[PDB]
Amino acid sequence: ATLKYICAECSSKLSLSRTDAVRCKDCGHRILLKARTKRLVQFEAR
Amino acid sequence: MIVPVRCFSCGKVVGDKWESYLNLLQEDELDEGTALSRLGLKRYCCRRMILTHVDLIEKFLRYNP
Amino acid sequence: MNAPDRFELFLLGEGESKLKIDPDTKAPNAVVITFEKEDHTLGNLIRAELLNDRKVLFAAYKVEHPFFARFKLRIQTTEGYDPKDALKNACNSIINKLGALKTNFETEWNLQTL
Amino acid sequence: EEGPQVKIREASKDNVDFILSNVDLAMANSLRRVMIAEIPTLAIDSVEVETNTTVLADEFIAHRLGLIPLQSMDIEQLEYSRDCFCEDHCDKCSVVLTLQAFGESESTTNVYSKDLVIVSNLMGRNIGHPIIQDKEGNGVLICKLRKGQELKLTCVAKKGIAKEHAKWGPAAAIEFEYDPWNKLKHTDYWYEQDSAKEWPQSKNCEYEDPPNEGDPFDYKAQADTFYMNVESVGSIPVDQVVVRGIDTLQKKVASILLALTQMDQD
Amino acid sequence: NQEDSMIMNQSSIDRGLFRSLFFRSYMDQEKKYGMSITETFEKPQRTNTLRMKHGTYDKLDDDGLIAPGVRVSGEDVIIGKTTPISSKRDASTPLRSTENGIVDQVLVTTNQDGLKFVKVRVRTTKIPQIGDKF
């Protein structure tokens, strides 16, 4: 459970905190995403 | 990108007809005008929906994540 | 953004009657019915049926502006006849005509084998 | 039989060709209008998205889900949530649909209207079934997924009319014609040399007598006899588009009679 | 449809005619002002933070960002930032007041010299309205 940030390329989840090192575990690439809110979003189908 | 469900002008479901149209062309070699008509798309509003579609989704799928 | 809610077309407003019957000043035995949350669908239908009534002297409807679903219908009848009654009869005639139309379609449909 | 009369020409699951005689054009039209706009249908109205790894936007998908036709046979025994007494929705007023899809296949994984599942209690009424007219039995293609592409969402379908949204439109195009020979002089034919040669003859010309030039203009003549074709989308069967259309317009008129009735009290 | 105006089939518009996606991207840096002064990504507290935006800060997680998926609206705070000077002033980024939508994606990065900076994408669907040009 919980995936604070995701990786841009390899798509491996990261879950890191403040001052942990902005990088991925295996691949180098400092890109990294955010992963959707667990507060489910509802839309009108119009 | 991705076949429209329902023709904009009259709202005849056109969502089901996509693969069927693409099939009547490769597998049946049939010309576009007959395939559309086979699929019962008679009004030009409905015809334009399929005939002029660009299924960009298929390119979009080519990217990994 | 400045777009009104779609139900505003059919759903009556807070304290807003379907009908508002106001009397015409300019002409004797003439009235003006404002139909809220209604369109041509009903207006032109009623107007055309009142035209069939012999005792009806004047009948016309107008949708004053398209942003609003309402129409004013003006009814003028011969002296002694009431325009509300004229509207009542035309309304009834329409229903009875539609009743037969349904019955006739139903009978004809049941005969089909497809 | 009585007043206006019908004479069906052709029938199917999807089309009704007929002739409406002994009617006012105003009535023929008012019915035509109602069929397009005021007949109630069930259609997806709220889409809660749990997961979407697709190439498409949450709302892009959401929009499509509304345009997917749902079984609205027993639509009449379902309440409009607005009129219903709950907090948001319930069984008495809605149909809950579920959609979970995933790219297990190396090949492109497709998401169809068939992949929708009813989760709400139907009260044993013909409602909310995604309409499948598709030969292969798939229905509407909602989405395409690749590998780790997941789509997990929930749909709340509600009773509504085409006036609110065109998704609740049970009818496709409604064909409507009268006087295939312009006997009524209701159109002035634009031409270059001959209007008869230049303008194509209607199908319905066969169902009416040609005017015969050696006759004066019938001014007294009025418009009765209407050649129509009602096309269904699926939600309601073709016949019921006509019947429910006749009934809606009838109910619509009754409301006026009733309104006048309540006004008489004061 | 007089003088270069046109009528649209509202029925067709519902069916998806001329709709479009819209993505705006908001950016923000965590700047370093010399030996001591450093901006911070966080959810500002209204007691120790000056000149707060009247907009709401509730949609911010404690890292000072909205998680992607939350629906936003006018004047709401996408990115929380403070520029400590002394306790600290509010340097936050609010969504444009004339717009709204749902957050599409939010990415955190460092640049050429390693300043933490964050990009936020916001998605709306624009459905053909009245003054809309074609």
Ligand SMILES: [Zn+2]
């Ligand atoms: Zn990586």
Ligand SMILES: [Zn+2]
């Ligand atoms: Zn069409």
Ligand SMILES: [Zn+2]
């Ligand atoms: Zn309910």
